[PDB]
Design a protein around this nucleic acid. Sequence first.
DNA 1: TTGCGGGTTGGTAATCACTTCGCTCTGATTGGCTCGG
DNA 2: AACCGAGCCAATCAGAGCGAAGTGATTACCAACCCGC
Lengths: 93, 58, 117, 68, 92
Amino acid sequence: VTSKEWIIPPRPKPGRKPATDTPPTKRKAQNRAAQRAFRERRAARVSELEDQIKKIEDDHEIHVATFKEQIANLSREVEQCRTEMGWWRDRSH
Amino acid sequence: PLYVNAKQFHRILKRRVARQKLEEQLRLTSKGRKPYLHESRHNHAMRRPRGPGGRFLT
Amino acid sequence: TWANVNQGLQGTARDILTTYWQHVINHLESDNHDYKIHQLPLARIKKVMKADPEVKMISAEAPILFAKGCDVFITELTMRAWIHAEDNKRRTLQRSDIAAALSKSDMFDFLIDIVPR
Amino acid sequence: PTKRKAQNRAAQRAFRERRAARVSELEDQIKKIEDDHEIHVATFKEQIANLSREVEQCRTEMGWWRDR
Amino acid sequence: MKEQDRWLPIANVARIMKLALPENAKIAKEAKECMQECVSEFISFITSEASEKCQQEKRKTVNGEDILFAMTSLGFENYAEALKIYLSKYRE
DNA sequence: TTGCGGGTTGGTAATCACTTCGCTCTGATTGGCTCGG
DNA sequence: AACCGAGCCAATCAGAGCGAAGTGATTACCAACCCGC
Ligand SMILES: [Cl-]
Ligand code: NA
Ligand code: NA
């Protein structure tokens, strides 16, 4: 069973068609540029926050995994030393 | 063994809850189906001009 | 990823199913799809979905996906069930023939309430 | 007319109030997740210390049966 | 909401079965009614897994992408990767 | 007090979508007989 | 031998579709005000 690599095209974003025209004043042009930026900058700090969440979520999963491995390494060391000691104990008498 | 598919199991139990609740709201007493649905088609099925073998025609 | 195709299926019964899914995939990649022409009516698929009072608004897409998805579902099960009938020397597809096919794969474990053991 | 124009406001006001509600929510979700894990990391460090001491005692005993 | 809203039309489900099998075959009225109940659950089953996931993100609209996710989630990888091709040709 | 550039607001505009009700044309319902199975 | 059932059939009419209206969602614009320089 084989298929080609098919990618789902994103559904067309809603809203008001972005103004095709250039404004004929540099003073209202720099306004447009700075306002348009404001709408992206705000919309970005909520978009970038899912990355902050998923960074912590992943960076904390790796540190958890290290401990859960490290305590199991130190748990088997107890279970090793107990039986090893038990041998020396019995072989002493 | 009797261990079922874990991917579905969680959703299978969720459905049993929703599937039971609906059956009561539908006011349906019987578990089995009805012999028919529409009386107009049932009545049209008797009026129905037939042949010797029960096949319909006009 | 494609493990559900020949799940609980061996002999020549494994090839016929894989051959179907390939035919399905090839005609999904190839022919121009009319998203109005459907073997199962779109309107009712939406009703089956909106029968769950947890679901509120449904995109036009989902019914259209289910229409095809159900067509391919029915067709594969009927074929799976049809093998069981020919193995037991029958021309009539019985309820038991379906039941028998549903127990072959753990994919159908959601239907156990519809057809118990 | 005003029946739709002023409604467009009521539905936009809702938009800003929903977006202003999520930005605050997800900011507080970071404080909890980063605190909740600051607990978990402090819990494992408690275990390592105890497991390590438990090893040290048992290694001193096996050391005692060999230290002659 | 009616009672037979929870099922798809039996004659439609049956017609797909007739086509799946040879011309010389026959299909039990019981077997048709079984298939109808099955395919109708297949819908409601996948929908519910897409419904709860949508309520987590707090959407109201259930979109085809949500369906394709719900399919891979409930071990319908084959169906999800097949309908992925249908949705992509639809959306353009 | 000039001028320049960026941020913020509320209000409007625009596009997409989802529902509901109305009209039209369809095709799902329909059972009694046969021969099979 | 005894039984059980699916095909057969083509007209009714309950719904499948279609578009209209409605409302929500979403993105974009702008005039006005603030702030730093
Ligand atoms: Cl082919
Ligand atoms: Na086909
Ligand atoms: Na096709």
